[model samples]
Target: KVFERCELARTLKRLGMDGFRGISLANWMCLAKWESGYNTRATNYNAGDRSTDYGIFQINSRYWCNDGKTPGAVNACHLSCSALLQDNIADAVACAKRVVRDPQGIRAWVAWRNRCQNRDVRQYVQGCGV
Candidate 1:
């Protein structure tokens, strides 16, 4: 589910994600773009430990969710990993808040570290009136 930038911005605002976890909407948009290209169904699999990251935020199965097949899964969010791969991003947003609250802050996402960290991404939501 690929979302238009404006639509995603509104949804993020509605979810109180603009400033939640110390992430600006602009930074979130930048992270989303780099991580999943704003695609809700995006999944990146890790072959080393057979863990998979799901959805726009790339919530990892290693800690935040269960891949079901992985042994000793933590599933801290108490939700199925598949739940993150959907157009309705409420679950994703809720889980992401939990992730950002950790000591890593938004650096939990490598995409943010590589692309959005300390970068001015105001242009991503420039015309959305968000």
Candidate 2:
């Protein structure tokens, strides 16, 4: 499912992403905007590491989810990588929350650091009324 801007904002908010671990809704929105563009089924295979990033927030297989293929995976999220691809986003959101519990917080996501950090990320949710 390709969610519209306000639709995704409201949906993520409803899923408790507004300030999960001190990360703002606007920040999550910005992350989703750049990571997957609100597309629920987005995936990226990393030939560099032989692991893959799955679903809307691009949860990675190496350290987060158990794909049973990523070598030396810690599987911190304790769910199948498949969970991240569902249109409902419930599992994906839960795993996303788990990611921030790390010491790095939202800094775990490279795109957020490069694109959203220290910028006017409010713009992503500005007109969306979120």
Candidate 3:
């Protein structure tokens, strides 16, 4: 059901009912809304570290990709979590889940605010760096 416009739909499709099949339609929509507002080009500028993270859900390429070692790890970004970065959705979704599990210190969370699935999400994010 999320495949309508979710950037991660491709990954689910690739996994053939194993990757994202368990997620409900409502959950998928909520996640999409919370993550990138369904915009596949979301980004963040970490004021504390001066890094730029990019992607549908703002998955930092620097943290997952080899670009992390590059001079502009944050700036030289990837649009998805998959190595290809194009049409790859599972990797991106996995990356996002990792962040949801550990938003603190991820740097991308620095830009996250009330824009979450709900108030609890906001609190979870605010609780970070404390």
TM-score: which candidate is best?
2
lDDT of candidate 2 over 8-115, digit per residue (tens): 998888888998999999999999989999998999999998999998899999999988988888788899998888889999999999999999999999999999
For candidate 3, the per-residue lDDT at 54 reads: 50
Query: Model 1 — TM-score against the truth?
Result: 0.95
Worst 10 residues of 1 by lDDT: 66-75
Off by over 4 Å in 3: 1-28, 44-48, 69-84, 101-113, 117-130
Which number leads on lDDT? 2
TM-score versus the correct structure, for each prediction? 0.95, 0.96, 0.44
lDDT of 3 by residue, 62-121 (tens): 555444433455322233333424344555655654554443422235334444323343
Note each model's CA RMSD in angstroms. 1.0, 0.9, 9.4
Steric overlap count per candidate: 0, 0, 0
> What lDDT does candidate 1 reach at residue 13?
92
Model 3 earns a TM-score of: 0.44
Q: How much lDDT does candidate 1 score?
A: 0.89
What's the ranking of the predictions by lDDT, best on top?
Answer: 2, 1, 3
